[PDB]
Design an enzyme around this catalytic site. Structure first.
Site, short mmCIF file in Angstrom:
data_model
loop_
_atom_site.label_atom_id
_atom_site.label_comp_id
_atom_site.label_asym_id
_atom_site.label_seq_id
_atom_site.Cartn_x
_atom_site.Cartn_y
_atom_site.Cartn_z
N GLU A 108 -14.38 2.29 -4.56
CA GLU A 108 -13.67 3.08 -5.56
C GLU A 108 -13.35 2.23 -6.79
OE1 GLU A 108 -10.37 5.70 -4.10
OE2 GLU A 108 -9.43 5.18 -6.02
N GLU A 129 -7.03 2.45 1.22
CA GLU A 129 -6.14 1.51 0.51
C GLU A 129 -4.86 1.23 1.29
OE1 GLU A 129 -5.42 2.90 -3.49
OE2 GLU A 129 -7.43 2.36 -4.17
#
Length: 323
Positions: free
Chosen positions: A237, A149
């Protein structure tokens, strides 16, 4: 030799064709599975026994190894294991997935403490990815997630693209055909911005992350822009909670996301297989003490039920041969 009837037996070496991930026989594949939480934080949860339960009882197709770069015990910290020993631990987990015939994501899990710009992890990311791609070249079942991320207002797609253009050549000199999954800005939301200037490499997919208590139509619309511009997306995710990983569970909105992913044949990986006392954790507290890998939380029950649906792929066949 992958075990008969397993996800990797059925689909073999995956590749990317346009916006779709396909099997070794060229058929569209949608994989469904689970992510680890921090490996240094829940090591009792990641064993041959626990992954055997995930495969045989939860019916997962894929497991993700979230290798935190920072925070206590992170790969860059030398607080839990030395970097090369952490490599050896990861290799062990990759081999357990091979023995069970499931796909394995090696996730260089950038997030906090400055790692939000993945470029700031390159002193370790380059030797990590050099090692992993050389070691796992001949492993058909691995996928390489090079930066979880990217985040920060300072971190634009241009910056993530420069990171990827540093790491991907290091991987591809060792392992030419393995799928690489590339994170996107704003905690892997800005797939539509990546789509304005995509990477020029083959067999690349782009990360989309959502949390059903936080992200709704706006993010699906952003993802649709990327799909329409030709990117293959992978949800490496997602959670059933708000983005913090605790609080209420939002199953109606998650059902909307599930229908949306199914219609687009987009693979998904749930956060997390761990027994931390937060509502996104799929196990009840104490499950790693008892070893009861089916002692699910409310969120784990919901995800295990989604995983129990018919497989979202068709076997390549030739079952009369070992694979």
């Amino acid at each position: 030799t992958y075990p008969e009837g397993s996800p990797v037996y059925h689909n073999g070496k995956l590749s990317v064709q346009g916006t779709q991930m396909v099997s070794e026989c060229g058929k569209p594949v949608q994989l469904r599975g689970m992510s680890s939480h921090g490996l240094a934080w829940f090591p009792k949860c990641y064993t041959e026994a626990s992954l055997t339960a995930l495969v045989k009882d939860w019916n997962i197709d894929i497991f993700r190894l979230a290798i935190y770069t920072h925070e206590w015990g992170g790969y860059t910290t030398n607080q839990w294991k030395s970097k090369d020993d952490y490599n050896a631990y990861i290799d062990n987990m990759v081999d357990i997935c091979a023995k069970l015939g499931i796909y394995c994501i090696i996730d260089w899990h950038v997030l906090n403490d400055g790692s939000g710009d993945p470029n700031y992890t390159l002193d370790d990311a380059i030797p990590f990815w050099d090692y992993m791609s050389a070691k796992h070249k001949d492993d058909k079942h691995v996928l390489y997630e090079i930066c979880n991320e990217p985040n920060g207002f300072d971190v634009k797609w241009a910056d993530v693209k420069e990171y990827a253009e540093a790491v991907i050549p290091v991987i591809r000199k060792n392992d030419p055909d393995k799928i690489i999954i590339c994170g996107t800005p704003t905690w892997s939301q800005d797939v539509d911005l990546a789509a304005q200037d995509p990477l020029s490499y083959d067999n690349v997919m782009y990360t989309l992350h959502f949390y059903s208590g936080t992200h709704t139509q706006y993010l699906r619309d952003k993802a649709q822009v990327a799909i329409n511009k030709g990117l293959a997306l992978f949800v490496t995710e997602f959670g059933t909670t708000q983005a913090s990983g605790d609080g209420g569970v939002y199953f109606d909105e998650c059902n909307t996301w599930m229908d949306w992913m199914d219609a687009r044949k987009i693979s998904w990986v749930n956060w997390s297989f761990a027994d931390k006392p937060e509502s996104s954790a799929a196990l009840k507290p104490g499950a790693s003490n008892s070893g009861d890998w089916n002692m699910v939380s409310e969120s784990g029950q919901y995800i295990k039920r989604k995983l129990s649906q018919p497989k979202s792929y068709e076997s390549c066949g030739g079952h009369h041969h070992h694979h």
